[PDB]
């Protein structure tokens, strides 16, 4: 049938407030392949965001990495918004620097 996406939001390097890093949202284990992923900054969609080329794992499920440079802070909140056919409502996952 169809498989819902697993989602992980994290940074490329250890988070250091005031220091430039990269924000990642890794969506995996989903099928079919169409998926909508947005990175958010304080609830607002970040404009410049890139993603890897569509590929899949041994179980045939797809995986994609969406990423964008960013400079962490104590106040600013970050998150990934994912929509897939298997989701009745877009799923939001906040960035947790300890995850």
């Amino acid at each position: 049938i169809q498989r819902t996406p697993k989602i992980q939001v994290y940074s490329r390097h250890p988070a250091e407030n005031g220091k430039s890093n990269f924000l990642n949202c890794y969506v995996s284990g989903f099928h079919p392949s169409d998926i909508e992923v947005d990175l958010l900054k304080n609830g607002e969609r970040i404009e410049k965001v890139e993603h890897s080329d569509l590929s899949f794992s041994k179980d045939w499920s797809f995986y994609l990495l969406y990423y964008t440079e960013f400079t962490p802070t104590e106040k600013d909140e970050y998150a990934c918004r994912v929509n897939h056919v298997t989701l009745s409502q877009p799923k939001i996952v906040k960035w947790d620097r300890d995850m």
Binding site: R12, P14, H31, D34, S52, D53, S55, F56, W60, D98
Partner: protein, 276 residues
Amino acid sequence: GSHSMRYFYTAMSRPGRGEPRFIAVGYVDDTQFVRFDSDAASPRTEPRAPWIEQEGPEYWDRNTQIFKTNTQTYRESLRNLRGYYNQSEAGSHIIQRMYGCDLGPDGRLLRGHDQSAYDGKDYIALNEDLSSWTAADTAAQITQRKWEAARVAEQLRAYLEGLCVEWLRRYLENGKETLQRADPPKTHVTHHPVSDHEATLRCWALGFYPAEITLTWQRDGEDQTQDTELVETRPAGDRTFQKWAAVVVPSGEEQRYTCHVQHEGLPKPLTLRWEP
């Protein structure tokens, strides 16, 4: 073995929104090196790793023609399978194909692969003998008779034992500084108090390559498999991967827990514990 090359093809139909999209990507171990997307402005095979750029024009035109030709053939195949399942022309479907060769640590062909799926379910796969097929259902059985009648296995075997291994060895050499370099994980243990009597110990592994790794928590020399939260290895975006394993423990008993890390880049497995 120690190395492999894989190509991954995805063809997706989308009725009412043009012809089926075809995308192809090639990898050597966990490093992608080429891509092709029939939806691009000007479809062409493009480089995705530094070491493949040196290939001449003939390489790229050859690749592009193959993927362009495939783009058309997969559209035919999607029509064929829709019929094999008596499906409607109104639904979107997906054929996926993975194929490649595995090399042993010495460089000899360990084994070849070629499997397909339809809508995420295994459909047909070339057996390890590289001579026979395993079809999942009566629909795939039609693809099988057709491929046996066209001596497809014979051609796959020649490529898998021939060109596949040849080009993989060439890539391994041109990109040896990275493809033949294992980067060990940077490890540490964090502590996150949950309640007055419980706390979370999270064992981290960062910046490692390749993606293969073993991360486990033990309590008293013993494994906490069923009690360990293990996230899926994830890409950092700089070629390396990350992974962590967590276990909730009774406050005060943290010293009875040890984290064990196994990675190709490690001459010897690592044992970690929380260091207050």
